[PDB]
C-alpha cells in the first residue's frame, strides 16, 4: 500500500512537500528542500499540485444523462426542457434513475470528485427517484460520499401534500432539507415554506439547502429569511442558499444592508455558472444581464461561496462532462475574477469552500485526516485552470481510485516537437 | 504519401465517407455503405468528424505570452493591463516578438488551426512588431497561412503620423487595413478615419478589418459607416467589423433598421467571446451586461458572424491555450445558443464562417481543393464541443502536420473501467 506522496506542491505554500500516509490517513506533512527520488510505495506528484478532492455541491442526478430522449431541446429554453422531460416519463423507473446517476458519478470519480450533493425531486407521491438514489448512495460510498437533498421542486405549500412528502423523504434518510420559495404561488407561501423547512431541519437534525431566488426578479428576497432564520437558530454552518441569481438584479443599497446579515448568519452560497449564464437573462432583450449571484463581493466580504455544475447532459443543460475546472473557468469569466491572484485562488471555489458548504468534517491535507487527495499535473491553480488539466491521480483512503494518462500532442515542423501548452 | 481518408463523418451528412487524395489535393469524395478496412496509405478517421481546418480570425500575436512579465495584472482590468505592458517595454524587440508569436502559433498548429489573422500595432514609428511579424508569416507558411492586419491601435487621426504609418505598413506588405473609430478623439475623426481606411484598401487592393465599436456606448455606431462604405464600393466580402460590442447595448428599433444594411452590405462580423465577457460590462455595477454582439440575431438573418480568441496569455486576457472549441464553448453560453442544433451547428462559427471572414479561396472538403483538413474524435459538432476533444490529426497538403494521442482515464471500482465521457 502507498506510504508516501512525494514532490507535491500545495496551494499558497512555497516549495515541495512530502505527505506521509498510514492506516488510510495522513500521518504527517513535511517540507522537502529538493526533489525526492521515487521508490516502492511512493506516489510521485512530480512537482504537480496536490489538493483535497474536488467537490460537487449542487447537481441533479435524478435528471442527468437524459438529453435527447426521446427528443432534443431545440430552442434550449427552460419551457421546452420541461416539455422534453415530460415526453420521457414512461422511461422514468427505479433502474433508469440508478443507471443514469451512476454514469455521471463515474465521470465525477474520473474527475477527482469525492464529495457530491445531489438534489432529488420529492414532489412525487411515489418518491421513485429518491428510493433509487438512496440505494445509489450506499453503492457509491467506497468512492464518493453522496449527500441527498429532499428537493420539493413543485413547492412545499403549492403542491398537494408537499410538506408531508418532504418530511417522508427525511424519514427515509435524505441528508438535507430543500425548498424553492420563489416558485411558491405567493410571497407569503414562500416565507412560510422557509419556516417549515427550518422546523424540519431542527426536528431531524439535518442540513438545509434552498433553491433560493433563482429568478431575475429584483423583488425576490427570500435569502434574507434564510439567513435570518439560520442566525436565530444559531445554525448557519448547516445552511446553504443555492443560486440567489436575483441578487444580480438588486439595487446596491439593499444589497449592502443585506450583506451585514449574510456575514453574521454564517450561511453558505452556491453559484452554478454554466447553468446560470444559460438560463438567466432569458426575459431581457438587449442588453442582457449575466445573472450570477454576487460572487466577487461575497469573497471580498468573507462570505463563503462556491460553484456547482447543477445539471449534466439533460433538458435544462445539454452539455457537461461533470468537470469542476470547467465550471470554475466559466465562473471566473462571468464574475470577472480575472486578475492573476483571483484566478489562482479560484481552486478554493471548487474545493475548500464547497467542503464547508457540505459541512464536511474530514477534509483537507492535514495530519489526522483521511488520505483523500488528488494530484493535478500543473504548477498551481492558475496553471491548472488555464490548461484545463485532467486529474492525474485520485487517492481515497490511501488508495488510487482513478488515474488519467495525459494526452500527447506532437506538431511536425522541420522536426517533430511535443506541445504541452506551457511557455 | 497518404492516398485516402476513410470512415469519415461530415457535418450535416448522413453516414460515412471516403476522401480521395492526389497531388496534395482532394480528388474525389465518395459515400461508403459501411466501415472500410484500414490499409497502407489510408488515414482512418475511425468514424470521427472530418472538417476543413479551424480558423483564428482575430488574435494579437504581437502581445501574446507576456502575462506576468515583469509583473502580473492583479485586478484583471484593462487599465492595469496597459500599465503592466508598459513595464515590459525594455524587452520588446524583433526577436522577442518572433519568439512569442511562434510559441502561440505552435499551439495553434497543435489545435488544428491552419488559417490565422493577427492584428499588429502600427502606432509605432519603428514598426518593430510589424517587421518581426512579416518574417514570422514567411517562416510559418508551410503550416499556417497568416494574414497581418495593420492595426493603428492609438488611432489614425488621433496619433502623430497615424495615417502615414498605416500606409507604410501596407507598403511593407500588411494584408489588411485596420482602424479603431471609437478610440479616436471625436466622432468626426472616427467617421473620417473610416473614409481613409477604405481609400487605402482600394488603393492597395487589401482587405479591411476594423476594431469597431468595442465599447459599452449605445451611441457608438461606427458599424453603419463600415457597412455603408463597403456597400458603396461593392466590396463587402473583403470587409470585417470586429467586436461591435456596442451593438449589445443598442435599442431594438435602431438595430432592426441597421440589420437591413448589414445584410445588404455583405460584410463580416467577428465576436471574441472569451475577451468580450471579461472586458465588457466593466462600468456596470449590478445588473451587469454580457457585452457580446448580436450573434444569434446575425445567424437568424443570414449575416456572416464568427468567433476569435483575441488574446492569449497576455495582460488583457491572462488565459488561453489558443483553442477554438473553448472559444466556441464560451460563445454558445453567453449568446444563449444552447439548443441542440444551435450547439451542433456551432462548428460553423470556427470553420466556414471564419474562412469567409478571411476571404479564403481554397477552403472546404471539396474536390479540387487543397487537402487541408482535420479529424476530431467525436460523432458530430455537439459531441466535439461537449467533450472539448483535441484534434486527432491535422492534414495539410495531404500530409500530417499534427497529431494528438488522446488521454486515457481509468476508474478503479470493483474492476478497472475506462471512462470516455460518452453515455
Ligand atoms: Fe438545482
Ligand atoms: Fe483585437
Ligand atoms: Mg435547476
Ligand atoms: Mg483588443
Query: Is A291 part of the contact surface with chain B (CB cutoff 8 Å)?
Result: yes
CB of B310 closer than 8 Å to CB of B274: yes
Query: Is B68 part of the contact surface with chain A (CB cutoff 8 Å)?
Result: yes
Q: Is there a binding annotation on residue B119? A: no
Residue A93, C-beta contacts closer than 8 angstroms, at least 6 positions apart: A128
Q: Which helix (H) or strand (E) holds B86?
A: helix B78-86
Burial-class residue B203 by CB neighbours within 10 Å (0-12, 13-18, 19+). Answer: exposed
**Most A CBs within 10 Å: which of B65, B110, B345, as the mutation test of the A interface?**
B110
Question: Which residues of chain A are in CATH 3.20.20.140 domains?
Answer: 54-361
Edge to edge, the sheet with strand A145-151 lists: A54-59, A113-121, A145-151, A176-179, A207-212, A239-243, A268-271, A305-307
Cβ <8 Å between A410 and B387: no
- Between the alpha carbon of residue A50 and those of residues A8, A44, A61, A354, A393, the distances in Å are 6, 11, 28, 17, 10
The count of other CB atoms within 10 Å of the CB of residue A347 is 23
Chain B's closest residue to A248, CA to CA, is: B287
Contact residues on chain A for B254, CB-CB shorter than 8 A: none
Helix, strand, coil % over all residues of chain B, rounded to 5: 35, 25, 40
The bound ligand whose nearest atom lies closest to the alpha carbon of B82 is: 4
- Pick from A227, A229, A220: nearest CA to A184: A220
Cis amide linkage into residue B272, ω under 30° from 0: no
Query: Annotated catalytic, B214?
Result: yes
Q: What is the spatial distance between Cα B23 and Cα B1, in angstroms, rounded to a whole number? A: 9
CA of A212 to the centre of ligand 1 (A): 10
Q: What is the DSSP letter of B9?
A: B
Residue A166, C-beta contacts closer than 8 angstroms, at least 6 positions apart: A122, A150, A152, A156, A177, A178, A196, A197, A200
Output the CA angle A350-A354-A360, nearest 5 degrees: 135
- Pick from B301, B267, B146, B387: nearest CA to A407: B387
| Superfamily of B1-53+362-423 according to CATH | Urease, subunit C, domain 1 (2.30.40.10)
CA of B418 to the centre of ligand 1 (A): 29
CA of B23 to the centre of ligand 4 (A): 40
For the record, the C-alpha cell of B207 comes out as: 482587405
CB of B189 closer than 8 Å to CB of B158: yes
Work out the end-to-end distance of chain B between its first and last CA atoms, rounded to an integer number of angstroms: 37
CB of A41 closer than 8 Å to CB of A371: no
Q: What is the DSSP letter of B317?
A: B
- Pick from B47, B36, B17: nearest CA to B392: B47
Helix, strand, coil % over all residues of chain A, rounded to 5: 35, 25, 40
Q: What is the spatial distance between Cα B277 and Cα B284, in angstroms, rounded to a whole number? A: 13
For the record, the C-alpha cell of B126 comes out as: 519603428
Residue recorded with cell 498605416: B166
| 3-state secondary structure string across A180-237 | CHHHCCCHHHHHHHHHHHHHHHHHHCCEEEEEECCCCCCCCCHHHHHHHHHHHHCCHH
Compute, in degrees rounded to 10, the torsion defined by CA atoms B227, B228, B230, B234: 130
CB of A339 closer than 8 Å to CB of A350: no
In chain B, residues 112-151 whose CB comes closer than 8 Å to chain A: 142-143
- Pick from A124, A98, A145, A76: nearest CA to A362: A145
Q: What is the spatial distance between Cα A221 and Cα B145, in angstroms, rounded to a whole number? A: 55
- Between the alpha carbon of residue A159 and those of residues A82, A123, A320, B290, the distances in Å are 17, 7, 31, 36
Q: What is the spatial distance between Cα B64 and Cα B101, in angstroms, rounded to a whole number? A: 7
For the record, the C-alpha cell of B247 comes out as: 451593438
CB of B288 closer than 8 Å to CB of B221: no
The count of other CB atoms within 10 Å of the CB of residue B39 is 10
- Pick from B145, B109, B199: nearest CA to A409: B109
For the record, the C-alpha cell of A190 comes out as: 414562500
Q: What is the spatial distance between Cα B63 and Cα B120, in angstroms, rounded to a whole number? A: 9
- How many residues are recorded in chain B? 423
Buried b (16+ CB within 10 A) or exposed e, A80-101: bbeebbeebeeebeeebbbebb
Output the CA angle B395-B390-A395, nearest 5 degrees: 150
- Pick from A384, A369, A237, A235: nearest CA to A323: A384
Q: What is the spatial distance between Cα A306 and Cα A325, in angstroms, rounded to a whole number? A: 12
- Pick from A160, A350, A189, A159: nearest CA to A273: A350
CB of B104 closer than 8 Å to CB of B64: yes
CATH architecture assignment, domain B54-361 = Alpha-Beta Barrel (3.20)
CB of B188 closer than 8 Å to CB of B196: no
Q: Which long-range contacts (CB under 8 A, 24 or more apart) does A367-371 make?
A: A367/A26, A367/A27, A367/A28, A367/A29, A368/A25, A368/A26, A369/A25, A369/A26, A370/A24, A370/A25, A370/A26, A370/A396, A370/A397, A371/A2, A371/A19, A371/A21, A371/A24, A371/A25, A371/A26, A371/A395, A371/A396, A371/A397, A371/A398
Which residues lie across from B42 on neighbouring strands? Answer: B4
Residue B146, C-beta contacts closer than 8 angstroms, at least 6 positions apart: B105, B116, B117, B118, B133, B136, B137, B140
CA distance B195 to chain A (A): 30
Residue B188, C-beta contacts closer than 8 angstroms, at least 6 positions apart: none
What backbone torsions phi and psi does residue B310 show, to the nearest 5 degrees?
Answer: 75, -70
Q: Please count the CA atoms within 13 angstroms of the CA of A292 that sit on its side-chain side.
A: 31
Q: What is the spatial distance between Cα B365 and Cα A221, in angstroms, rounded to a whole number? A: 55
Residue A83, C-beta contacts closer than 8 angstroms, at least 6 positions apart: none
What resolution in angstrom units was achieved for this structure? 1.3
Q: Is there a binding annotation on residue B310? A: yes
**In sequence order, what DSSP letters do the residues of B183-224 get, joined into one string?**
GSSSHHHHHHHHHHHHHHHHHHT-EEEEEE--SS-TT--HHH
Q: Please count the CA atoms within 13 angstroms of the CA of A233 that sit on its side-chain side.
A: 24
CB of A331 closer than 8 Å to CB of A36: no
For the record, the C-alpha cell of A249 comes out as: 438584479
Q: What is the spatial distance between Cα A222 and Cα A190, in angstroms, rounded to a whole number? A: 7
Rg, chain B, Cα only? 22
Residue recorded with cell 465550471: A327
CB of B388 closer than 8 Å to CB of B325: yes
The bound ligand whose nearest atom lies closest to the alpha carbon of A210 is: 1
For the record, the C-alpha cell of A24 comes out as: 488510510
Q: What is the spatial distance between Cα B144 and Cα B107, in angstroms, rounded to a whole number? A: 12
- Pick from B137, B51, B52, B84: nearest CA to B311: B84
The two beta strands, B408-412 and B399-405, are unpaired
- Between the alpha carbon of residue B361 and those of residues B21, B53, B115, B370, the distances in Å are 19, 14, 12, 10
CB of B59 closer than 8 Å to CB of B118: yes
Residue A367, C-beta contacts closer than 8 angstroms, at least 6 positions apart: A26, A27, A28, A29
For the record, the C-alpha cell of B30 comes out as: 465518395
What backbone torsions phi and psi does residue A28 show, to the nearest 5 degrees?
Answer: -165, 155
Burial-class residue B300 by CB neighbours within 10 Å (0-12, 13-18, 19+). Answer: exposed
The count of other CB atoms within 10 Å of the CB of residue A46 is 14
CB of B377 closer than 8 Å to CB of B392: yes
Work out the end-to-end distance of chain A between its first and last CA atoms, rounded to an integer number of angstroms: 37
Question: Which residues of chain B are in CATH 2.30.40.10 domains?
Answer: 1-53+362-423
CB of A149 closer than 8 Å to CB of A175: yes
CB of A72 closer than 8 Å to CB of A117: no
Cβ <8 Å between A72 and B339: yes
Cis amide linkage into residue B287, ω under 30° from 0: yes
Cβ <8 Å between A250 and B286: yes
CA of A183 to the centre of ligand 3 (A): 12
Strand segments (E) across A2-105: 4-8, 16-22, 25-32, 42-44, 49-51, 54-59
Residue positions of A in the annotated binding site for Fe(2+)? 58, 60, 211, 310
CB of B207 closer than 8 Å to CB of B239: yes
CB of B211 closer than 8 Å to CB of B243: yes
For the record, the C-alpha cell of B307 comes out as: 468567433
Q: What is the spatial distance between Cα B350 and Cα B347, in angstroms, rounded to a whole number? A: 5
Burial-class residue B270 by CB neighbours within 10 Å (0-12, 13-18, 19+). Answer: buried
Contact residues on chain A for B342, CB-CB shorter than 8 A: 74, 76
CA of A26 to the centre of ligand 2 (A): 50
- Between the alpha carbon of residue B19 and those of residues B5, B25, B32, B369, the distances in Å are 5, 10, 10, 12
For the record, the C-alpha cell of A332 comes out as: 471566473
Q: What is the spatial distance between Cα B324 and Cα B270, in angstroms, rounded to a whole number? A: 13
- Between the alpha carbon of residue A370 and those of residues A20, A204, B291, B412, the distances in Å are 12, 27, 46, 19
The bound ligand whose nearest atom lies closest to the alpha carbon of A308 is: 1
The two beta strands, A268-271 and A239-243, are parallel
Q: What is the spatial distance between Cα B66 and Cα B68, in angstroms, rounded to a whole number? A: 6
Q: What is the spatial distance between Cα B12 and Cα A250, in angstroms, rounded to a whole number? A: 45
CB of A112 closer than 8 Å to CB of A402: yes
The count of other CB atoms within 10 Å of the CB of residue A7 is 21
Q: What is the spatial distance between Cα B409 and Cα B420, in angstroms, rounded to a whole number? A: 7
CB of B243 closer than 8 Å to CB of B178: no
Rg, chain A, Cα only? 22
The count of other CB atoms within 10 Å of the CB of residue B109 is 27
Q: What is the spatial distance between Cα B25 and Cα B33, in angstroms, rounded to a whole number? A: 24
- Between the alpha carbon of residue B143 and those of residues A413, A421, B61, the distances in Å are 8, 18, 16
Cβ <8 Å between A411 and B388: no
Amino acid at each position: 500500500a502507498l506510504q508516501t506522496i512525494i514532490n507535491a506542491r500545495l496551494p499558497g505554500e512555497e516549495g515541495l512537500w512530502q505527505i506521509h500516509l498510514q492506516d488510510g490517513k495522513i500521518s504527517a506533512i513535511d517540507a522537502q528542500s529538493g526533489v525526492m527520488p521515487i521508490t516502492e510505495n511512493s506516489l510521485d506528484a512530480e512537482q504537480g499540485l496536490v489538493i483535497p478532492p474536488f467537490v460537487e455541491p449542487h447537481i441533479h442526478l435524478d435528471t442527468t444523462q437524459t438529453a435527447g430522449q426521446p427528443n432534443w431541446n431545440q430552442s434550449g429554453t427552460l419551457f421546452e426542457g420541461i416539455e422534453r422531460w415530460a415526453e420521457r416519463k414512461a422511461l422514468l423507473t427505479h433502474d433508469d434513475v440508478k443507471q443514469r446517476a451512476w454514469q455521471t458519478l463515474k465521470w465525477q470519480i474520473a474527475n477527482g470528485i469525492q464529495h457530491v450533493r445531489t438534489h432529488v425531486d420529492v414532489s412525487d407521491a411515489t418518491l421513485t427517484a429518491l428510493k433509487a438514489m438512496l440505494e445509489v448512495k450506499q453503492e457509491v460510498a467506497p468512492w464518493i460520499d453522496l449527500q441527498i437533498v429532499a428537493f420539493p421542486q413543485e413547492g412545499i405549500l403549492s403542491y398537494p401534500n408537499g410538506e408531508a412528502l418532504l418530511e417522508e423523504a427525511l424519514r427515509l434518510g435524505a441528508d438535507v432539507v430543500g425548498a424553492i420559495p420563489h416558485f411558491e404561488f405567493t410571497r407569503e407561501y414562500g416565507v412560510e415554506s422557509l419556516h417549515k423547512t427550518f422546523a424540519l431541519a431542527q426536528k431531524y437534525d439535518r442540513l438545509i439547502d434552498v433553491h433560493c431566488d433563482e429568478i431575475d426578479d429584483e423583488q425576490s428576497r427570500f435569502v434574507e429569511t434564510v439567513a435570518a432564520l439560520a442566525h436565530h437558530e444559531g445554525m448557519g454552518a448547516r445552511v446553504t442558499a443555492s443560486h440567489t441569481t436575483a441578487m444580480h438584479s438588486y439595487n446596491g443599497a439593499y444589497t449592502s444592508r443585506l450583506f451585514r446579515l449574510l456575514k453574521m448568519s454564517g450561511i453558505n452560497f452556491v453559484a452554478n455558472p454554466l447553468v446560470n449564464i444559460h438560463l438567466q437573462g432569458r426575459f431581457d432583450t438587449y442588453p442582457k444581464r449575466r445573472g450570477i449571484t454576487r460572487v466577487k463581493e461575497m469573497l471580498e466580504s468573507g462570505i463563503n461561496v462556491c460553484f456547482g455544475h447543477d445539471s449534466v447532459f439533460d433538458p435544462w443543460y445539454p452539455l457537461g462532462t461533470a468537470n469542476m475546472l470547467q465550471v470554475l473557468h466559466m465562473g471566473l469569466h462571468v464574475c470577472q475574477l480575472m486578475g492573476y491572484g483571483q484566478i489562482n485562488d479560484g481552486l478554493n471555489l471548487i474545493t475548500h469552500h464547497s467542503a464547508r458548504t457540505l459541512n464536511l468534517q474530514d477534509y483537507g491535507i492535514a495530519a489526522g485526516n483521511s488520505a483523500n487527495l488528488i494530484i493535478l499535473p500543473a504548477e498551481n491553480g492558475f496553471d491548472a485552470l488555464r490548461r484545463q488539466v485532467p486529474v492525474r491521480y485520485s487517492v481515497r483512503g490511501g488508495k488510487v481510485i482513478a488515474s488519467t494518462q495525459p494526452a500527447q500532442t506532437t506538431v511536425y515542423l522541420e522536426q517533430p516537437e511535443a506541445i504541452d501548452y506551457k511557455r
